[PDB]
Design a protein around this nucleic acid. Structure first.
Ligand SMILES: [Mn+2]
Ligand SMILES: [Mn+2]
Ligand code: NA
Length: 356
DNA sequence: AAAAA
């Protein structure tokens, strides 16, 4: 019996139901744009459960016993079985507001508010936005436009590994005992991604040394002429606060970067300007919270949402990227690994490549 | 506001 929770399912990259889930993901995205959080959630949960199936749905009978499949979702599945297409997802793909929001938010530094503003000004193309002489752009948007083609081009695994080497080389220069882990999609086994994420932690660094590492590493890259964009968010981490109930950024020190990746550093089968702009996120966390941060940054987004929902509604536990708190025992639960977090929650361990 | 798993 398939659980309603993604954290009680194994979801691997062999998706047998992409015809259904691509349509459900488009409908979910449109509901996000139309500020319909409820309908967004229903389509996300339906898409998520179908992603876990070990077989493709080929008739409506195949949906029997599957949770999170309401009447609206079942009408969409039925329509796709009928002629291989979703008329509902096709109408969203042709909607002018949806097309504009996808296109405008594809720019690094452009979110829902700026995309809405430009749409209501009558803009429909990125060429017309970039060349406009009255528009004013943030430093993030300037970098988003300057390196647009490289950033919309997926990072592959040889590129992610080349970035990992750069990160590790820079980090150990200032903290030789530091542990650097590639998180996000690549840790879940993905062949491609929009960016490369890392978690950095040090067993012996002080509170100040921990604070200074991201500044030292980015200044080093700035000197090397590799830092194309850099934004460091200082930590707001509280050692003794209860975990968050919010469904939001973690409080660890982090940085959102664009690095210059020289082609010579990439060891691929295919080995222009001779370099590629790469989005890189670095997160620094205290050593004792490394398992919670790793679990939160590994994802997927839906796996994280269900993990936190399961902890709260089924175990009366409060989980986030910094800690795990037991409301019944009135104690924080410690973990040195992700396995220990799953064991505290009463969950079978789900491998990172099973969290997709 | 937007940058995130
Ligand atoms: Mn990522
Ligand atoms: Mn990222
Ligand atoms: Na964006």
């Amino acid at each position: 019996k398939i659980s309603q929770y993604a954290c009680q399912r194994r979801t691997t990259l062999n998706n047998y139901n992409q015809l259904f889930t691509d349509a459900l993901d488009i409908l979910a995205e449109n509901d996000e744009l139309r500020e319909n959080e409820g309908s967004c959630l229903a389509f996300m949960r339906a898409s998520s459960v179908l992603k876990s199936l070990p077989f493709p749905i080929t008739s409506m009978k195949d949906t029997e016993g599957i949770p999170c499949l309401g009447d609206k979702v079942k009408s969409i599945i039925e329509g796709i079985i009928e002629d291989g297409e979703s008329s509902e997802a096709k109408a969203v793909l042709n909607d002018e507001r949806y097309k504009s929001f996808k296109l405008f938010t594809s720019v690094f530094g452009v979110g829902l508010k700026t995309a809405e503003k430009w749409f209501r000004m009558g803009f429909r193309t990125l060429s017309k936005i970039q060349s406009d002489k009255s528009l004013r752009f943030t430093q993030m948007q300037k970098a988003g436009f300057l390196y647009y083609e490289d950033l919309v081009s997926c990072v592959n695994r040889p590129e992610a590994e080349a970035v990992s080497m750069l990160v590790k080389e820079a980090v150990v220069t200032f903290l030789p005992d530091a542990l650097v882990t590639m998180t996000g999609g690549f840790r879940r086994g993905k062949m491609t991604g929009h960016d490369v994420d890392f978690l950095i932690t040090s067993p012996e660094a002080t509170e100040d040394e921990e604070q200074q590492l991201l500044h030292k590493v980015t200044d080093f890259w700035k000197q090397q002429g590799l830092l194309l964009y850099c934004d460091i968010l200082e930590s707001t981490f509280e050692k003794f606060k209860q975990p968050s109930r919010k469904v939001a950024l973690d409080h660890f020190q982090k940085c959102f970067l664009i690095l210059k990746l020289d082609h010579g550093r990439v060891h691929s089968e295919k080995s222009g300007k001779g370099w590629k702009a790469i989005r890189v996120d670095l997160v620094m966390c205290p050593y004792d919270r490394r398992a919670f941060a790793l679990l939160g940054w590994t994802g997927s987004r839906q796996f994280e949402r269900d993990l936190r929902r399961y902890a709260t509604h089924e175990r009366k536990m409060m989980l986030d990227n910094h800690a795990l708190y037991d409301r019944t025992k009135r104690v924080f639960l410690e973990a040195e690994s992700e396995e220990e977090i799953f064991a505290h929650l009463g969950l079978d361990y789900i491998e990172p490549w099973e969290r997709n």
